[PDB]
Design a protein around this nucleic acid. Structure first.
Length: 535
RNA sequence: AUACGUCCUGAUAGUUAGUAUCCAUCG
RNA sequence: CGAUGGAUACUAACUAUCAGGACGUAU
């Protein structure tokens, strides 16, 4: 419901001061907080951008969330928003087109990479950004593009101070032990320079969502050795499904279930088996249906058929599942997060959870009456899996226990954040574009592809490798970077001595990058020359 | 018989680097 | 094709603990 609540407006007031990250539970409509905040600061956007007004930018990982968020933003606000995705091909635009877009629009939504491209090629300054929103921020580890955005936070001046919002459901994306939960949290908070908050009053969540969490039922298959032609786990799965339908015999009403699988072929064949067995005229089998949502885009450049699970096809199958046409869904770990599904009360984890975050998200999925979180585990690993579950549960407990009086800011830990190894190529300083050390490879590939020639798939640049040792005889590396022969330059160049292979690659790319600009092969914005091929 | 210092082998855990496999994402 | 993230198996080095073997000193 689109109604403000006391226990959420208190968090709104808490976040009004500085940048804040919320750790509200799943299914709580956390986007309500974001829309409320975007409503609160609506009085600063009227400023025109010919003279220096401010707009808002939104960050989203993947395509399906784009329209989902845009719909809510457009529905519950009078603002004239725009939608931008990489599929349309906006990179072909020029400065004036982008400026017209800025003048026309009020609120802009896009994926992660587009902001990298706009900033780095100098199409706009970090100024004039009233706000920024970070959903599923816990991806900002190592070299995710969020970190490359936030690099410009400190290198540039602090003349603009955009407030930072924080939405997440899990705060660590790798396995951990209970004694090591504070280190990663402190590091992440330092990177984003914010404070993580938590829920206070789950007055309505504890009634129909928190209390309706799936109680764990663990069942051991006994694979110690026409259904006789398949593995015993299949027969046990049929038996346990029949046990579940022992409940649905009286409750023959509509319901939907999720069967998470790992291997693609497993998902492929379970649908065929289910459809074949649905013809036994059984009362349970009288309503049995199956369909694929697995694989997603998979390898975009063919390399497999798999029906390819086309984006249009995915939209079709998701729509037909949401409406209630089908009941049983066979999936890989693609629907676990970032999409709305009709309520379910039966999850068959045909394969075990991998790490902490995956287990949390999988357990959170079921929401209907008497949800049953089910795990099929061999009897011989039952104790190991039980102690792993104990470890996960204590990690969750200490996580929910540490988030009290979290009013301490990182402060100097943000300054302590490390840097790269070489200065970026900045021909005109802050008045010119930038080329970071860790982004030259993609730009070189892009220029080579856009370089007028036959688009051979083998056109990837040629590199040579050599292993040496320094004076102290540590491991050392070096590479040489080839550029296309059709280009005015042909001879390859060698970079600086880096201690790892990929570091040497990136350094070589950076060193060669400025070379093509300085001789006039790059525009004023370091982009590939936009002169038409007719000329 | 004990303690301290040096060399070697095995077990425990962590860091670093190499190889292979599997899943997911966008460009 | 590129760029990212997660997990498993093998290998190598470093570190710390323990065990065992060898040498020297003290009791």
């Amino acid at each position: 419901e689109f109604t403000p609540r006391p226990y959420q407006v208190e968090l709104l007031e808490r976040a009004m001061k500085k940048n804040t990250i919320v750790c509200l539970g799943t299914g709580s409509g956390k986007t309500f907080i974001a829309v409320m905040l975007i409503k609160e600061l609506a009085h600063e956007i009227r400023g025109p951008f010919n003279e220096g007004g401010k707009r808002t930018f939104f960050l989203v990982n993947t395509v399906p969330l784009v329209n989902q968020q845009a719909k809510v933003i457009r529905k519950h606000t009078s603002l004239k928003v725009g939608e931008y995705v990489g599929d349309m091909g906006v990179d072909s635009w020029n400065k004036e087109k982008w400026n017209q877009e800025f003048e026309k629009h009020q609120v802009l939504v896009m994926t992660a990479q587009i902001f990298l491209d706009i900033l780095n090629h100098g199409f706009i300054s970090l100024s004039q950004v009233n706000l920024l929103i970070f959903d599923e921020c816990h991806h900002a580890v190592k070299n995710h593009p969020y970190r490359q955005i936030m690099r410009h936070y400190k290198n540039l001046e602090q003349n603009d101070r955009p407030r930072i919002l924080g939405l997440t459901a899990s705060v660590i994306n790798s396995k951990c032990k209970p004694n090591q939960v504070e280190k990663k949290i402190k590091e992440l908070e330092a990177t984003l320079n914010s404070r993580v908050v938590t829920a206070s009053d789950l007055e309505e969540v504890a009634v129909q969502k928190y209390a309706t969490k799936p109680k764990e039922i663990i069942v051991s298959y006994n694979s110690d050795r026409s259904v006789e032609f398949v593995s015993p786990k299949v027969k046990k799965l049929l038996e346990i499904l029949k046990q579940y339908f022992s409940n649905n015999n009286n409750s023959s009403k509509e319901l939907c279930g999720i069967i998470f699988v790992e291997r693609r072929y497993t998902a492929y064949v379970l649908y065929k088996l289910l459809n074949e067995l649905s013809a036994k005229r059984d009362d349970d089998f009288s309503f049995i249906k199956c369909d694929f949502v697995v694989g997603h885009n998979s390898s975009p450049s063919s390399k497999e058929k798999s029906t390819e699970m086309n984006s249009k096809k995915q939209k079709e199958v998701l729509k037909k599942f949401r409406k209630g046409e089908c009941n049983l869904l066979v999936a890989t770990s693609v629907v676990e997060e970032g999409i709305d599904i009709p309520k379910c009360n039966l999850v068959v984890r045909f394969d075990l959870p991998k790490n902490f975050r995956s287990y949390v998200q999988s357990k959170g999925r079921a929401r209907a009456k008497n949800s049953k979180y089910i795990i099929m585990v061999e009897e011989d690993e039952k104790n190991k899996f039980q102690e792993d579950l104990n470890q996960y549960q204590e990690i969750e407990k200490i996580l929910l226990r540490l988030c009290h009086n979290r009013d301490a800011p990182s402060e100097e830990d943000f300054d302590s954040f490390e840097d790269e190894l070489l200065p970026p190529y900045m021909p005109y300083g802050t008045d010119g574009p930038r080329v970071t050390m860790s982004s030259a490879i993609s730009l070189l590939h892009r220029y080579c592809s856009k370089l007028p020639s036959d688009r051979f798939t083998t056109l990837t640049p040629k590199f040579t490798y050599i292993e040496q040792n320094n004076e102290e005889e540590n491991k050392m590396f070096r590479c040489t970077l080839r550029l296309p022969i059709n280009s005015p330059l042909r001879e390859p160049i060698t970079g600086q001595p880096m201690p790892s292979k990929k570091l040497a690659k990136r350094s070589a790319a950076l060193e060669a990058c400025k070379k093509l600009h300085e001789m006039g092969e790059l525009d004023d914005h370091l982009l590939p020359v936009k002169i038409s091929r007719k000329n």
